[PDB]
Amino acid sequence: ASATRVIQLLRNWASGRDLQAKLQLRYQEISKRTQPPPKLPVGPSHKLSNNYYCTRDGRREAMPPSIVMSSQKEKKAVTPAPPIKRWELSKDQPYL
Amino acid sequence: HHALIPHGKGGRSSVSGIVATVFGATGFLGRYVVNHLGRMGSQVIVPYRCEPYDTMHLRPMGDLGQIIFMEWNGKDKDSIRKVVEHSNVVINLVGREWETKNFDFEDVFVKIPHAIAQVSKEAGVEKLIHISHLNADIKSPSRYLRSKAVGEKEVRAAFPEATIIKPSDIFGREDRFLNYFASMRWFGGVPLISLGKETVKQPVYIVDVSKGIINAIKDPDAKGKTFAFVGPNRYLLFDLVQYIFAVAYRPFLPYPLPHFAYRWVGRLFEVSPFEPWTTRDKVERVHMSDMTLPHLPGLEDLGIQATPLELKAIEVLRRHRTYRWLTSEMEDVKPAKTVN
Amino acid sequence: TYKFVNMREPSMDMKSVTDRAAQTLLWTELVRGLGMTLSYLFREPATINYPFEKGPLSPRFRGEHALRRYPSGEERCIACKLCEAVCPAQAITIEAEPRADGSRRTTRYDIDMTKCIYCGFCQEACPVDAIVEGPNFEFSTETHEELLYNKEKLLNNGDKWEAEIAANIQADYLYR
Amino acid sequence: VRTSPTGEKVTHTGQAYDDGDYRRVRFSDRQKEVNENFAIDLIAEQPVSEVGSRVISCDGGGGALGHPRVYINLDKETKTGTCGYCGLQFRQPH
Amino acid sequence: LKKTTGLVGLAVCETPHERLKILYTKILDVLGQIPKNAAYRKYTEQITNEKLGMVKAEPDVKKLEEQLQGGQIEEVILQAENELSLARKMLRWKPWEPLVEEPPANQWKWPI
Amino acid sequence: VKPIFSRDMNEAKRRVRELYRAWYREVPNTVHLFQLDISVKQGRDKVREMFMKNAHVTDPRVVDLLVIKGKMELEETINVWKQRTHIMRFFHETEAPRPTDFLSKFYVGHDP
Amino acid sequence: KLDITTLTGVPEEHIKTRKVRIFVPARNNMQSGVNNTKKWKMEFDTRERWENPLMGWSSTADPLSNLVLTFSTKEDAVAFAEKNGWSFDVEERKVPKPKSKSYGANFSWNKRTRVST
Ligand SMILES: NC(=O)C1=CN([C@@H]2O[C@H](COP(=O)(O)OP(=O)(O)OC[C@H]3O[C@@H](n4cnc5c(N)ncnc54)[C@H](OP(=O)(O)O)[C@@H]3O)[C@@H](O)[C@H]2O)C=CC1
Ligand code: SF4
């Protein structure tokens, strides 16, 4: 910024931080508005051979739901899934 | 010249086909007439003289494009021409209860109506509606009433088939007649010439008058017919004012007005460097019973039935109702005495 | 995986107790907040001097729709109605007839800027880059009717803003 | 841009309010927005390109900035081939 | 003894093993009244017996929590109470009975 | 068929009677609180008309459902959840009369 | 005798004065696909459409102008119409009659089916 040294010292002491290092206002550090022309890459399906849509047709591979039980026509107890594992306290900062 | 086929269900978006130019649309009657035209989907070419801010309240009444606001000059006739050029119906509501400096009673009741009628005829306007009080007459003592009669004759002269409606006292939410009496309580006591014992009044409801105008526009037979709008019942001035003060629940302080004794009060009102408290002609209107003109057709001829004042008085005068009735709900009041 | 906010126990030693008693009695934390506000007072304000200074915008900005022309001057739109189909708010009404030259052109192209949501569709759908939301954003009107654009209004907007619109498209046409 | 008998500026679509029509009132103290540039005149003014191949391709210029590429047949000597999108005209020499 | 369970509204149980034993025994007693061939009875008995065996075998709260994989042991006792209530209502509902009614012809056909 | 609240038409009629009672006694309070300009008799006449609108119903479940809706509307009116606009919506004041004779319909528009 | 008319909230004019058409939509003759002809459709009667004065857009006052419903079978559509108290007209499904196609017939020795080209 354009602040005088005295004002910088005062604002930094009031903050308790060095505000000059990280300034909310943006200066020349921002990217240039005009940029060199881009050339975006093509995807996996841009091939001239072995690219039949039948192989990569996602939608046509969906199927109607499978019917596990239908009313209209020992065994171990089971759960919807294995029980969730307990989370572990973060190493970087366990307590804020 | 400009014939439009009606389309739609008569709603806000429907095309009624009545392209109209409501002069004095910003007025108490205009506020309702425009509303009805818009709800029918009638294109209303509103001529204004004031700031657009004042005309802003008319904007919501019509759909997009239905309401066109164009400034017009009261004296200049080219403004009248441009505002009636593409109109099949023109309604004349240019009345000033008091007399202004620039515009006198004659200016607004003879020259302006006659100019409008003449220019409407030049443009080819199919139907014209003119408004003049039933009391207004070529011999009526009130100058404004006399000017209204002269303008009525001139309007008939310029527009032979114009439907000149002749309404009685009009009351409504933004009335100047009922509200006048309600505010007389502020003015010391209740001034009552002859205690209002010689002034029978027949007030018509504003909505009834507006719908009457609209139906007259719609009905073919209305052309070249001097309609007269009369109230459902006739009341003595004392009775009406008493009922007003009852529904308002304001302390009735009726002191009669001796001509000479209260003439000094009227002179003081005139002495004011501003207008003589809405002129003395308004007080003359108060000092006059409604004329009974049964020969002229009435509301029922158009099919609209006049709504009784008693039912609509509560709505009109609840605004003047204060903590006087808010804190003390008590009960309601009784209908005014009907001199019929 | 998870972190405990709060869940901290204050020390009970006499020094810590004295410090916390000082904070309560001497309003230390309030003074810290006050100092923060003071520092922000001495920092440079972020206000830009509108209208003399304008906020940054990118070439892909979506503003007032503008029908464009070919360099020859012929109007680009070819009455495909693809824009009307994708329009998520049905703000585009298109009518077409074969014109005298025999080309497929639009007799009516109305964009109701009161129903449009400025989604950016149509600009990405039109096969001929006809309707292209221009850079203009300050086109407020005093009446509702002014915002119901017509084909003449859209073409006038395109003619007015073509210098900027062509440059913005040139900037962004490779990303599309 | 021709002017109608009422004095209105007729549009490139040919739209003009008739003297009987009441909708002309909307321009009483305002203006009717008409684009002076007419597409048909400008597309007419463009010179007809002469190409020596039976089939030619018009992209409208600018490559991806124009219109979808179409191939135009120019065998007919009587009539010039016209681009469906661009509207430019081409014909074989002689 | 943990200071807090960590979840508000859940308090540390001073005697977790005894509470769990009592709750599991009450669950088994309620399940006894359920008919023998009811699937609910069989599965709940299996789970309850496994839990009770683990509870009796392990004397350490942390090890028991690791073995049960039911979260903190207070959550386990809450879950046991919930199971007790479910079983008590199941006795009234009798879900083991056959289906009340077959659905209409195409009540579950999609697309229509 | 499972009954909503009444197993027979008579019981539904009893519920209708209760709802009518409640609306009837509520009407003057509505007029006073909402500062409506209608008379109490006018409102009660509208109530009667609304109740007779559903009279043709000949199924107990439909009657019960209508009663539920009536109760909800009455609760709204008893509270100030409904505004003066909502209360007056019953009185189609703004809407112009729609003629019902054939000749008037033929004149006005193409509608059947 | 199910009647939901009171509960639907539809105003009486559209309940009484509207005729609903129950049909299987015919194939768009421009295309040979038939997938759009496999489900019954319920469509209301057409009403007046007029031009808006301002822009010329088609304005309507019929709330059910765009309402169309899909039903698997004719009976389901009929039941829905009856429960809603709408007068209904049912158009029977039109199926393409079986045709006899022979590529050999294009080269008949004596019959007229021989193709010139
Ligand atoms: N009791 C009643 O209301 C009765 C009414 N009438 C007549 O009904 C008509 C309308 O009544 P109402 O609406 O209540 O009256 P208002 O006085 O409330 O409004 C009359 C209108 O006249 C316009 N006006 C007045 N003088 C001029 C002028 N010099 N130039 C342009 N415009 C002018 C006003 O516009 P602006 O406000 O901008 O000046 C206003 O819109 C009037 O002609 C009145 O005399 C007759 C009998 C009874
Ligand atoms: S940006 Fe507006 S006009 Fe364009 S497609 Fe989206 S909604 Fe329609």
Side-chain angles (χ1 to χ4, degrees), chain B residues 23-31 47-51 54 72-75 92-97 100 103-104 107-109 112 130-134 144 148 165-171 174-177 206 285:
Chain B
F23 284 87
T26 61
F28 166 49
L29 181 58
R31 289 179 52 97
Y48 74 87
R49 62 165 299 183
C50 55
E51 219 180 59
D54 319 309
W72 82 296
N73 184 16
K75 306 173 182 186
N92 184 68
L93 293 78
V94 189
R96 208 59 176 175
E97 189 177 55
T100 82
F103 283 76
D104 53 71
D107 300 354
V108 295
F109 293 119
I112 290 180
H130 181 50
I131 309 305
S132 289
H133 204 292
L134 253 196
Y144 110 97
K148 222 154 179 50
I165 300 183
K166 294 199 63 59
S168 175
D169 290 318
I170 304 177
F171 68 98
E174 30 268 313
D175 176 24
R176 294 183 184 177
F177 187 71
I206 180 70
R285 299 170 69 251

Side-chain angles (χ1 to χ4, degrees), chain B residues 6-10 39 173 311 314-315 318 321 326 329, chain F residues 32 34-37 84 93-95 98 108-111:
Chain B
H7 292 126
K9 293 234 308 286
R39 81 176 49 170
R173 314 183 91 109
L311 295 185
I314 176 59
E315 334 186 11
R318 188 171 271 171
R321 167 204 183 184
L326 197 51
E329 292 294 331
Chain F
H32 182 75
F34 296 81
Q35 300 190 350
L36 309 171
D37 294 327
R84 170 156 36 191
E93 298 186 331
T94 46
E95 285 155 23
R98 197 63 168 181
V108 166
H110 324 256
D111 296 318

Side-chain angles (χ1 to χ4, degrees), chain G residues 9-101:
Chain G
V10 186
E12 209 61 50
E13 318 96 61
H14 307 93
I15 292 183
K16 299 295 172 58
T17 67
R18 298 202 71 86
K19 190 83 174 310
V20 76
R21 182 173 186 265
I22 298 180
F23 64 97
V24 166
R27 56 170 288 263
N28 177 17
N29 241 72
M30 303 297 303
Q31 301 204 237
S32 302
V34 303
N35 190 86
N36 290 9
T37 70
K38 298 179 179 298
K39 285 295 173 293
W40 290 81
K41 212 73 66 58
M42 220 185 61
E43 173 181 337
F44 286 85
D45 61 328
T46 312
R47 301 290 263 259
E48 176 186 16
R49 297 189 184 91
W50 65 94
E51 286 188 353
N52 188 48
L54 186 60
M55 295 296 301
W57 303 334
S58 284
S59 305
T60 194
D62 183 16
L64 306 96
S65 62
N66 308 333
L67 216 290
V68 104
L69 295 183
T70 302
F71 297 88
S72 73
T73 67
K74 173 221 309 302
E75 291 72 21
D76 298 328
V78 171
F80 208 76
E82 291 177 344
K83 105 175 66 173
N84 292 281
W86 287 320
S87 182
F88 61 92
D89 142 71
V90 178
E91 319 281 19
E92 309 303 308
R93 172 189 290 268
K94 211 73 58 59
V95 291
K97 77 173 187 301
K99 314 295 196 304
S100 180
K101 314 296 293 176

Side-chain angles (χ1 to χ4, degrees), chain E residues 35-53:
Chain E
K36 270 301 292 86
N37 54 1
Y40 180 71
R41 172 210 265 265
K42 308 182 181 300
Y43 289 113
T44 322
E45 281 183 359
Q46 163 181 354
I47 305 160
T48 308
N49 293 326
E50 288 155 350
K51 301 279 181 56
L52 196 51

